[PDB]
Design a binder for this molecule. Structure first.
Ligand SMILES: CCCc1cc2c(=O)n(C)oc2c(CCC)c1O[C@H](C(=O)[O-])c1ccc(C(C)C)cc1
Lengths: 263, 247
């Protein structure tokens, strides 16, 4: 049985590399020391954003918004990536189509914030496929309320990154996130938990093998799932505010569908 | 050691029985069948008879009992190996944020699809009578019921709940903690005992351990949801009484 799980772990890590251009291993390399060819351009203020805009997508107003539409572009691209990955999870495409949609609807942002921690450190976040690095302080100072988006993600990334996970661990765990039978509105819950049950078993074996001297990483990792949940709810509120105060900004149909009647 | 955990598990169960009068085994006997039938509160008349506006007096009985549960829980928490040896401000902080979660976890023992055992198991208030309360209060306990039904589906017994409760208390991410290390260290022994307990007592349920930890999220969401409901009652709400229940 160990063998079957080991194979599933291998399978998932494989689809993970194929589905995501910027892995956590690559992100760490850039963030730390391969500083010569992989060194990012840093954006810490109003002006550097323009100086560096060569690789990116009332000054305050415009700026706070160029970043907004920028996160939106990347978001939709991330969704598309996560959707591609989901199809590789054994069993996922054989489920009721309606449920596939429902697992993605509530699963995608939870996955997005998890993997986004891979791109963050105490001081900031990699942007533009690793080529850029926007500082935490700059983001926290954008025109109000656009400055309240990122802090709670940074707060999580810092904690979650303390678990020292690598992509092979991440691949299984984000699959476990997706295959959650507790998502509101699912039709056939039993087929979904039968799969998740197998995924957790893979994650438990994987975690014991990769982090032997890390007592209850499996349990600690599972509890982090309450942190992501809280981050999307707080997030949704943030967006509802913006759609009223900024009636000129458009949401992308893909993100709009995800959010519509979510919780 | 695989036997140090079985000791700890055993220890908590004994303490848990000592600390909470109405166990799950005992509430399950009363909710399904086993003679001295509890008094049913299914409508306005059965209520005032059971005693032997209304929307309000009912919500405040839950508060009264919550205040009781909080004392039963802290008394229990102090028997958890290592808890008492933690910085006093932290013990207060853990209990402060953990009681609501532990309160729902246990209320689900006194619950089923159609009602909740009230008053030490003497009563039983129908889900319907509660769902049908005034404009604010009719949606009060309904969220707890949906949780209960889902959580009860795991079929945990008191011996499991006792360790699971301990784990909740020793949550190392409570806001304002001063020394997290020891808290998480304790939770690890607790998580180790909970895993071994579930594998031995529930061999067929493959990842019950994991299913149970995922419920801690459903739980936090129900508490954040309850708190925001206490907001709405306040902004639409006896001095010493107010003090006993300040929260
Ligand atoms: C972690 C970034 C969160 C995020 C940050 C910002 C921000 O600073 N501005 C100015 O607008 C934002 C939006 C709204 C986009 C419509 C965000 O939420 C997006 C969403 O709600 O989808 C989003 C966009 C990109 C990403 C990538 C980093 C994966 C994640 C979330």
């Amino acid at each position: 049985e160990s063998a079957d799980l080991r194979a599933l772990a291998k399978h998932l890590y494989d689809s993970y590399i194929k589905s995501f251009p910027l892995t956590k291993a690559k992100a760490r390399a850039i963030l730390t020391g391969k500083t010569t060819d992989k060194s990012p351009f840093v954006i810490y203020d109003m002006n550097s954003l323009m100086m560096g805009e060569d690789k990116i997508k009332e000054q305050s107003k415009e700026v706070a918004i160029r970043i907004f539409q920028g996160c939106q572009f990347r978001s939709v691209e991330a969704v598309q990536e996560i959707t591609e990955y989901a199809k590789s999870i054994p069993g996922f495409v054989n489920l009721d189509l309606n449920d596939q949609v429902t697992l993605l609807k509530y699963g995608v942002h939870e996955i997005i914030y998890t993997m986004l921690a891979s791109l963050m450190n105490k001081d900031g976040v990699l942007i533009s496929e690793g080529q850029g690095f926007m500082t935490r302080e700059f983001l926290k100072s954008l025109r109000k309320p656009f400055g309240d988006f990122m802090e709670p993600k940074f707060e999580f990334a810092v904690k979650f990154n303390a678990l020292e996970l690598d992509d092979s661990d991440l691949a299984i765990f984000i699959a476990v996130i997706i295959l959650s039978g507790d998502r509101p509105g699912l039709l056939n819950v039993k087929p979904i938990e039968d799969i998740q049950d197998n995924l957790l078993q893979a994650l438990e074996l994987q975690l014991k093998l990769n982090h032997p001297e890390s007592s209850q990483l499996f349990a600690k990792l599972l509890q982090k799932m309450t942190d992501l949940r809280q981050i999307v709810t707080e997030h949704v509120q943030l967006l509802q505010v913006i759609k009223k105060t900024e009636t000129d900004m458009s949401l992308h149909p893909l993100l709009q569908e995800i959010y519509k009647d979510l919780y």
